[PDB]
Amino acid sequence: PQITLWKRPLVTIKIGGQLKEALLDTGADDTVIEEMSLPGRWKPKMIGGIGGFIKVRQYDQIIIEIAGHKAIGTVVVGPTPVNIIGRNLLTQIGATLNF
Amino acid sequence: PQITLWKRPLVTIKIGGQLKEALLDTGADDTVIEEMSLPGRWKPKMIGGIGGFIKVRQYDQIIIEIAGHKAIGTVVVGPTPVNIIGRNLLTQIGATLNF
Ligand SMILES: COc1ccc(S(=O)(=O)N(CC(C)C)C[C@@H](O)[C@H](Cc2ccccc2)NC(=O)O[C@H]2CO[C@H]3O[C@@H]4OCC[C@@H]4[C@H]32)cc1
Ligand SMILES: [Cl-]
Ligand SMILES: [Cl-]
Ligand SMILES: [Cl-]
Ligand SMILES: [Cl-]
Ligand SMILES: [Cl-]
Ligand code: NA
Ligand code: NA
């Protein structure tokens, strides 16, 4: 698809069998998801946004569908104001920025 | 141009006669620039993201050249850790997400 940016580029994702809404975010290195349960072990990570840092739980090789495209990669979980799909999984679904 | 997302989508911008590097950021509603002076009136605003909120000064009708494309709109200025081109100006240069 071709997505214009007059509105937020929100898409449906599926993770852990659950449907969620997420922002396709070229300004995010990482994929950041609201508090939820994921399988396996996690390791710690500090991510920094506009208003400082938050601690998150990093899970690798998580299976997630994004706007209908399968990805498998790292997802970090923590107190984000919105689910964010960052460049690590945008590259997996073949997304580009064009103008 | 077509920008792949293996790396941060950083471009050169010109604003207020200065050159800066900025992130093309589809996850950003607004265009947020680090502390600088801009001409005209301004009003205070709070904007928030990962970590919390920052106070910024909102300037209207500001022209920015974004990787060679001129665009005009609101720019907010404050203690952001990175210069960000948000959707309010990405739309003006015709930027889209494609996959
Ligand atoms: C109202 O208008 C706004 C409101 C909010 C924002 S924002 O900067 O807070 N953000 C909104 C979003 C979190 C809902 C835009 C994002 O693109 C920021 C943009 C951003 C980038 C860097 C630093 C600060 C902000 N990215 C970001 O926080 O990425 C996080 C997660 O991944 C890491 O990669 C990034 O690079 C490493 C750190 C960040 C980490 C911008 C304009
Ligand atoms: Cl919107
Ligand atoms: Cl979708
Ligand atoms: Cl990954
Ligand atoms: Cl605007
Ligand atoms: Cl358009
Ligand atoms: Na795992
Ligand atoms: Na103005």
TrEMBL record, chains A, B:
Pfam families: RVP (PF00077). SUPFAM superfamilies: Acid proteases (SSF50630). GO terms for biological process: proteolysis. GO terms for cellular component: host multivesicular body; virion membrane. It is found in: Host endosome, Host multivesicular body; Virion membrane. It is a lipid-anchor. Residues 20-89 form the Peptidase A2 domain. Keywords: Aspartyl protease, Host endosome, Hydrolase, Protease. It comes from the Viruses. The keyword Hydrolase applies. The keyword Protease applies. One of its GO terms (molecular function) is aspartic-type endopeptidase activity. This is Protease. It comes from Human immunodeficiency virus type 1. The gene is pol.
